[PDB]
Amino acid sequence: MTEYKLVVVGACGVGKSALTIQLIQNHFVDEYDPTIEDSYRKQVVIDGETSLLDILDTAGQEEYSAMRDQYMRTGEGFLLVFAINNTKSFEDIHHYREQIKRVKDSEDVPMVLVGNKSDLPSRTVDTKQAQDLARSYGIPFIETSAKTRQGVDDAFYTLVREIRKHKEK
Ligand SMILES: *[C@@H](Cc1nccs1)C(=O)N1CCN(c2nc(OC[C@@]34CCCN3C[C@H](F)C4)nc3c(F)c(-c4cc(O)cc5ccc(F)c(C#C)c45)ncc23)CC1
Ligand SMILES: Nc1nc2c(ncn2[C@@H]2O[C@H](COP(=O)(O)OP(=O)(O)O)[C@@H](O)[C@H]2O)c(=O)[nH]1
Ligand SMILES: [Mg+2]
């Protein structure tokens, strides 16, 4: 069976855990310990192909050991998550893209920009800004809400389609 290694990255509090649990369980978690970093597996059918998605939900203290670089290097695709009500989380996206570029030693790594918490009215990052950033990186932009499940399957399934496009090159 085909297997895809996906990694969910972004600032603390953006909804990485909430998005992962929404994809895995179809339930919204109000509280998920921000120190818990773990991987989950879900069997899905995407465009007729059965596959196992192994999703690493990053968390815990920010550190950069060589062991952590090697663990991130195993990721085939990354969701760059920011929250639409947190400008600092959007400003931090460049850091996450640079760290992916550094450990993968590549300019062409499958990624999707995800603007989470789209259910909140307290927007501080406009959709146009996020679309321009994703255009500058050559990647898709998807608006999500882990609370209502808006865009959740689209974010993960779009990342799987980007990994498929990369494996074809
Ligand atoms: C919060 C978890 C909490 N623990 C306790 C209380 S809350 C959470 O979800 N986190 C914490 C932050 N993590 C993390 N943070 C960053 O950068 C954060 C910023 C903001 C403070 C200063 N620092 C630099 C920038 F200004 C942004 N970067 C992380 C990071 F890059 C990696 C990591 C590590 C290595 O070795 C390689 C690597 C390669 C690709 C990657 F995508 C990432 C990632 C992510 C890599 N790990 C954690 C980082 C995690 C989330
Ligand atoms: N309204 C709303 N709250 C969310 C959403 N996603 C996450 N949250 C909340 O934001 C907080 C941080 O979410 P969490 O998944 O722990 O973020 P992480 O640190 O990136 O793993 C929690 O209180 C979640 O319930 C979302 O899309 N909408
Ligand atoms: Mg978390």
Curated annotation (Swiss-Prot):
<dbReference type="GO" id="GO:0019002">
    <property type="term" value="F:GMP binding"/>
</dbReference>
<dbReference type="GO" id="GO:0009898">
    <property type="term" value="C:cytoplasmic side of plasma membrane"/>
</dbReference>
<keyword id="KW-1003">Cell membrane</keyword>
<keyword id="KW-0547">Nucleotide-binding</keyword>
<dbReference type="GO" id="GO:0010467">
    <property type="term" value="P:gene expression"/>
</dbReference>
<keyword id="KW-0963">Cytoplasm</keyword>
<protein>
    <recommendedName>
        <fullName>GTPase KRas</fullName>
        <ecNumber>3.6.5.2</ecNumber>
    </recommendedName>
</protein>
<dbReference type="GO" id="GO:0005829">
    <property type="term" value="C:cytosol"/>
</dbReference>
<dbReference type="GO" id="GO:0001889">
    <property type="term" value="P:liver development"/>
</dbReference>
<dbReference type="GO" id="GO:0010628">
    <property type="term" value="P:positive regulation of gene expression"/>
</dbReference>
<dbReference type="GO" id="GO:0043495">
    <property type="term" value="F:protein-membrane adaptor activity"/>
</dbReference>
<dbReference type="GO" id="GO:0035022">
    <property type="term" value="P:positive regulation of Rac protein signal transduction"/>
</dbReference>
<feature type="modified residue" description="N-acetylmethionine; in GTPase KRas; alternate">
    <location>
        <position position="1"/>
    </location>
</feature>
<dbReference type="GO" id="GO:2000774">
    <property type="term" value="P:positive regulation of cellular senescence"/>
</dbReference>
<keyword id="KW-0122">Cardiomyopathy</keyword>
<feature type="binding site">
    <location>
        <begin position="116"/>
        <end position="119"/>
    </location>
    <ligand>
        <name>GTP</name>
    </ligand>
</feature>
<dbReference type="GO" id="GO:0035900">
    <property type="term" value="P:response to isolation stress"/>
</dbReference>
<dbReference type="GO" id="GO:0005525">
    <property type="term" value="F:GTP binding"/>
</dbReference>
<dbReference type="GO" id="GO:0030857">
    <property type="term" value="P:negative regulation of epithelial cell differentiation"/>
</dbReference>
<dbReference type="GO" id="GO:0051146">
    <property type="term" value="P:striated muscle cell differentiation"/>
</dbReference>
<dbReference type="GO" id="GO:0060441">
    <property type="term" value="P:epithelial tube branching involved in lung morphogenesis"/>
</dbReference>
<dbReference type="GO" id="GO:0030036">
    <property type="term" value="P:actin cytoskeleton organization"/>
</dbReference>
<dbReference type="GO" id="GO:0019221">
    <property type="term" value="P:cytokine-mediated signaling pathway"/>
</dbReference>
<dbReference type="GO" id="GO:0005741">
    <property type="term" value="C:mitochondrial outer membrane"/>
</dbReference>
<dbReference type="GO" id="GO:0030275">
    <property type="term" value="F:LRR domain binding"/>
</dbReference>
<keyword id="KW-0225">Disease variant</keyword>
<feature type="binding site">
    <location>
        <begin position="10"/>
        <end position="18"/>
    </location>
    <ligand>
        <name>GTP</name>
    </ligand>
</feature>
<dbReference type="GO" id="GO:0048873">
    <property type="term" value="P:homeostasis of number of cells within a tissue"/>
</dbReference>
<dbReference type="GO" id="GO:0021897">
    <property type="term" value="P:forebrain astrocyte development"/>
</dbReference>
<dbReference type="GO" id="GO:0008542">
    <property type="term" value="P:visual learning"/>
</dbReference>
<dbReference type="GO" id="GO:0016601">
    <property type="term" value="P:Rac protein signal transduction"/>
</dbReference>
<dbReference type="GO" id="GO:0003924">
    <property type="term" value="F:GTPase activity"/>
</dbReference>
<dbReference type="GO" id="GO:0044877">
    <property type="term" value="F:protein-containing complex binding"/>
</dbReference>
<feature type="modified residue" description="N6-acetyllysine">
    <location>
        <position position="104"/>
    </location>
</feature>
<comment type="function">
    <text>Ras proteins bind GDP/GTP and possess intrinsic GTPase activity. Plays an important role in the regulation of cell proliferation. Plays a role in promoting oncogenic events by inducing transcriptional silencing of tumor suppressor genes (TSGs) in colorectal cancer (CRC) cells in a ZNF304-dependent manner.</text>
</comment>
<keyword id="KW-0636">Prenylation</keyword>
<keyword id="KW-0832">Ubl conjugation</keyword>
<keyword id="KW-0564">Palmitate</keyword>
<dbReference type="GO" id="GO:0000165">
    <property type="term" value="P:MAPK cascade"/>
</dbReference>
<dbReference type="GO" id="GO:0051385">
    <property type="term" value="P:response to mineralocorticoid"/>
</dbReference>
<dbReference type="GO" id="GO:0014009">
    <property type="term" value="P:glial cell proliferation"/>
</dbReference>
<dbReference type="InterPro" id="IPR027417">
    <property type="entry name" value="P-loop_NTPase"/>
</dbReference>
